[PDB]
Structures are given as structure tokens and as C-alpha cells.
Design a protein around this ligand. Structure first.
Ligand SMILES: OC[C@H]1O[C@H](O[C@H]2[C@H](O)[C@@H](O)[C@@H](O)O[C@@H]2CO)[C@H](O)[C@@H](O)[C@@H]1O
Ligand SMILES: OC[C@H]1O[C@@H](O)[C@H](O)[C@@H](O)[C@@H]1O
Ligand SMILES: OC[C@H]1O[C@H](O)[C@H](O)[C@@H](O)[C@@H]1O
Length: 490
């Protein structure tokens, strides 16, 4: 039955639906919009549950009231919800039209210890997310960074227990870095970065620097230092000593560094997912993480932008499949934040391969047998963008004889706004939804399309780093259709 080809669609809510003062500003206005979404067949909505808003007053001083009101309204409107545990700041990344810092009490600690922030070679501290360097340092009034994240999720679970039991929440997206994605803040607009700059390594805080020095010493090269020839944010690879042909990135020193740098992210994600699994154990919800889509420089040997962001991906080394393998033990979903782009839409001097990157990432996930989801990177309202999203959702089209061999677990659309509801735009959006649903009407019971959610089980045993890195072996991607068989047209 065709319903087996159904891929659910979710819509991200406006940034700041509950403001920095923890107030659900305009319920009536949101309601009108939500009702239009429900009428259009949208399965659910997505929202940031901001750490800086909820635990503002002080350690474990949570206030869930405003969010309880929002969830209540969402439920009343007949929509499901994807909740993002947002442990990051809103404001310095593309589209961030509102400023929401992390808890002030944490920022106060940052005044006496600047090394709790990601730091670049020049010494500039980025305050949008706590460096992985302090994940296990008990410097926050007795707690470590991971314990803070853990306590937060447990409080959410307990205080929103009625919504969880009633099945309102479909999945919990655990924020793991800038913009909620598992990556280093290598391309900060707040520091002057501009596409398609290669970005900069963010491993200069005292915690990461010390870990590196100890590591190279144990490797027999105590004299090795962090990269000093990688250039600046807006450089091009060929103008740097680190990324040029036969440059530092290909030397024993460079390879060791890149492995160390990317490994920190894998472990960061694995340890926090462990806590998320314990916090939501038994609940009918799934776990998910977000991976950034860094398509610029993907078509040159150095893959410079990916490397500075923490994804050690080269033409002969898969830097994404190891992440997918790590996710399997947690039975988590890999959410890829860039599915609507086409190579031809990118300037040629950027050497961008968004289409190829998507194929590589989704294929790796399916090969590791995990579920994969995604979202468009930039606001788009045209047919071509929707058709590309639909192609990626079902790479080999629909199957009239049963379920498709390949399909994404869901797609989240960024973002709900007055522009989207404009007559003509919303008209196209409705067709996008219909096509994602494979020409079927909105289906309220997820079980009908094999998306039933069972109680979250405990995570499987820890997978050693060496086994994770075996996933770096390059593999051929699954075959992709040149265009979707379920086009929106125009
Ligand atoms: O509201 C979710 C999330 O949205 C923004 O980050 C997006 C980004 O704009 C996209 O281009 C892509 O990278 O996915 C990101 C995460 O969904 C905000 O910048 C971020 O703070 C917020 O959590
Ligand atoms: O915010 C950065 C964005 O700027 C836009 O002008 C470009 O078209 C995007 O490709 C880029 O990601
Ligand atoms: O991190 C912010 C955004 O940067 C750019 C990436 O293509 C996108 O996937 C990401 O969401």
C-alpha cells in the first residue's frame, strides 16, 4: 500500500515563540498559524527549548510554565512535536533574528575562566556554546557541563510527563554544539566569517590545548604543536600551508591532529547521548542529533571547511559514517541540516558539492542501518527546492508494491513565517506536503505507515573508538534518481 511511502513533514516554529523573559508572547497569533498548518496536512512542528531561558535564575532553577502552555496549544491544534534541547545561544548564526544567550550564571563563571569557551588561534572566545574541553570538569558550582545537560533533560522529562505519556512529543533532538549541531564553531559570522571562507580550528582553549599536548607526547612527539599554518577564516585553501597540495594536513603531524580533533566530537556526542538515553528511558520518543552540511570545498582534495568544523572527511576517508555508527548504539536518528541545495546554485569559486555530500551522508546512515532525517538549510519557497527535498527523501522513488528501499524518517521545514503563509507560497507548500506523503491524505496514526514509536530502550554497549573508525573506509553511495517521480512541478 502507497501509505508505506509516506514521509512525515514537520515545521519549525518562529524563533522566540517564548521570549527571553520566559513568556509565551502571542498564543492567539500562533494558534491561527498552527490551525492553517493542521489544515494543510502538516504532521507536526519543531521548537527550541532554550537552556538560557529555562535555567536562567540559577543552578537547577527551572521554570517550565511558558513551555507547558505552548505544548498545550500545540496538542489542542492536533499536531505532534519535535523538541530540541537547545544548549546553545541564538543570535550569531544565519537567520538568528533574536538574541538568546546561555544562562547568565554560566556566563558569570566565564568571566573568571574564559577557557570554558571555544577559542581560536588569535585568542577570541566564542560564547555561544561551552567547549567540549569542559564536558567533565566540575567547575560549574560543583557540576560538570555534561551533568548540567543531564539534569536539564531529566527535569524536562519529569515536568512534561503528561505530554510525553499522551504521545505529543515524537522525538528529542539533543543539541551538541553551535546552532545545536555536533560541530565546532569554525565559521562564525560574529567574527567576520563569510562564505565560502575555509574557517578556523577552534581547539585553543586551555583544556583542549593541554589534552593535545599530552596526546602527542604519548605518541612520541611531545614537540608537536597545534596548527599554525592553517590561515584565517576567510582564506582559500591553496593560500595556506596546512591545506595546500602536499601541505601539513597530509603529514604524520597533521593526520594525528585531525584525528584527535574529530575524535573529540564523536566522544562528546556519545557521552551526552548516554545521558539523554537515561533521562528519557521508557518514554515513547526517539533520540536524534544534528549534523551540519558543509558543502563548500567538498570538491577539492583538502575538504578544508569540513575539517575545520570537525568532520575529518577526505576523498579517501569517510568522516561521517563513524558518526552514524556511534548513533546506532543509541538507536538515534541522524538529522542532516542541508537537503534542498543543488550544485549549480553555488558560486563556482566555492567548489561546492551539496548534492554529493547529501548522497554520501544519507548512504552512510542507511549502510549503518540507522534512521536518517533532515531539514533545508536556507529559506526556500520555490518548486525546485521542494523537488530536491522530495528527491532526497526517496532517492529511488516510490514503490507501488510496498515500502521504498530507501527513504528518510522525516523532514523538518525551516521555518514558519508570514512569508510561508502568503497565498501563492503556501499553495506550493501544500503540494510539497502532498508529495512527501506520496499523494496520500494526512495520516494521523503513524503506525499505518510503519512509524510507530515504542518505549525508548537503554543504549547498547559502548563501541570502542577503533571500531568506530573502521567506518572511515570509503564506500560507494546508493544510486540516486536524476529527479523525483513525485514532482511538485512549479
Ligand atoms: O530553530 C532551530 C535552529 O535553527 C537555526 O539553525 C539552523 C540553521 O539555520 C540551518 O542552516 C541548519 O544549519 O540547521 C540549523 C539547526 O536546525 C538557529 O541558528 C539555531 O540556533 C536553532 O536551534
Ligand atoms: O548567511 C550566509 C548565506 O548567505 C547567502 O547570501 C548565500 O546565498 C548562502 O549560500 C549563505 O549560506
Ligand atoms: O550551522 C548553520 C548552517 O551552516 C551552513 C550549513 O550548510 C547548514 O547545514 C547549517 O545549519
Amino acid at each position: 500500500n502507497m501509505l508505506l511511502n509516506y514521509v512525515p513533514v514537520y515545521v519549525m516554529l518562529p524563533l522566540g515563540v517564548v521570549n527571553v523573559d520566559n513568556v509565551f508572547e502571542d498564543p492567539d497569533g500562533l494558534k491561527e498559524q498552527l490551525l492553517q498548518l493542521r489544515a494543510a496536512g502538516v504532521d507536526g512542528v519543531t521548537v527550541d527549548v532554550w537552556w538560557g531561558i529555562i535555567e536562567l535564575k540559577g543552578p537547577k532553577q527551572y521554570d517550565w510554565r511558558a513551555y507547558r502552555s505552548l505544548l498545550q496549544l500545540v496538542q489542542e491544534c492536533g499536531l505532534t512535536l519535535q523538541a530540541i534541547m537547545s544548549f546553545h545561544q541564538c543570535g550569531g548564526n544565519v537567520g538568528d533574528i533574536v538574541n538568546i544567550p546561555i544562562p547568565q550564571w554560566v556566563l558569570d563563571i566565564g568571566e573568571s575562566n574564559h577557557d570554558i569557551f571555544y577559542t581560536n588561534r588569535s585568542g577570541t572566545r566564542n560564547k555561544e556554546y561551552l567547549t567540549v574541553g569542559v564536558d567533565n570538569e566540575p567547575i560549574f558550582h560543583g557540576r560538570t557541563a555534561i551533568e548540567i545537560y543531564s539534569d536539564y533533560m531529566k527535569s524536562f522529562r519529569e515536568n512534561m510527563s503528561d505530554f510525553l505519556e499522551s504521545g505529543l512529543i515524537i522525538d528529542i533532538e539533543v543539541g551538541l554544539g553551535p546552532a545545536g549541531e555536533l560541530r565546532y564553531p569554525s565559521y562564525p559570522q560574529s567574527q567576520g566569517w563569510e562564505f565560502p571562507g575555509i574557517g578556523e580550528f577552534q581547539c585553543y582553549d586551555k583544556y583542549l590545548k593541554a589534552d593535545f599536548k599530552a596526546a602527542v607526547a604519548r605518541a612520541g612527539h611531545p614537540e608537536w604543536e597545534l596548527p599554525d599554518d592553517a590561515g584565517k577564516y576567510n582564506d582559500v585553501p591553496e593560500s595556506t600551508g596546512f591545506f595546500k597540495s602536499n601541505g601539513t594536513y597530509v603529514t604524520e603531524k597533521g593526520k594525528f591532529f585531525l584525528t584527535w580533533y574529530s575524535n573529540k566530537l564523536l566522544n562528546h556526542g556519545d557521552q551526552i547521548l548516554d545521558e539523554a538515553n537515561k533521562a528519557f528511558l521508557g518514554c515513547k520518543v526517539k533520540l536524534a542529533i544534528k549534523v551540519s552540511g558543509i558543502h563548500w570545498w567538498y570538491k577539492v582534495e583538502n575538504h578544508a571547511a569540513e575539517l575545520t568544523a570537525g568532520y575529518y572527511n577526505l576523498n579517501d576517508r569517510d568522516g561521517y559514517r563513524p558518526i552514524a555508527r556511534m548513533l546506532s548504539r543509541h538507536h538515534a536518528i541522524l538529522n542532516f541540516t542541508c537537503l534542498e541545495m543543488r550544485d549549480s546554485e553555488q558560486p563556482s569559486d566555492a567548489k561546492s558539492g551539496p548534492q554529493e555530500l547529501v548522497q554520501q551522508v544519507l548512504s552512510g546512515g542507511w549502510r549503518e542501518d540507522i534512521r536518517v532525517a533532515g531539514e533545508n538549510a536556507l529559506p526556500r519557497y520555490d518548486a525546485t527546492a521542494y523537488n530536491q527535498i522530495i528527491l532526497n527523501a526517496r532517492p529511488q522513488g516510490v514503490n507501488n508494491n510496498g515500502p521504498p528501499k530507501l527513504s528518510m524518517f522525516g523532514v523538518t521545514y525551516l521555518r514558519l513565517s508570514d512569508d510561508l503563509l502568503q497565498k501563492s507560497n503556501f499553495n506550493i507548500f501544500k503540494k510539497f506536503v502532498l508529495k512527501m506523503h506520496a499523494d496520500q491524505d494526512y495520516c494521523a496514526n503513524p503506525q499505518k505507515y510503519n512509524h510507530a514509536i515504542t518505549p525508548l530502550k537503554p543504549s547498547a554497549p559502548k563501541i570502542p573508538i577503533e571500531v568506530l573508525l573502521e567506518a572511515t573506509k570509503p564506500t560507494l553511495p546508493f544510486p540516486w534518481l536524476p529527479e523525483t517521480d513525485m514532482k511538485v512541478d512549479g
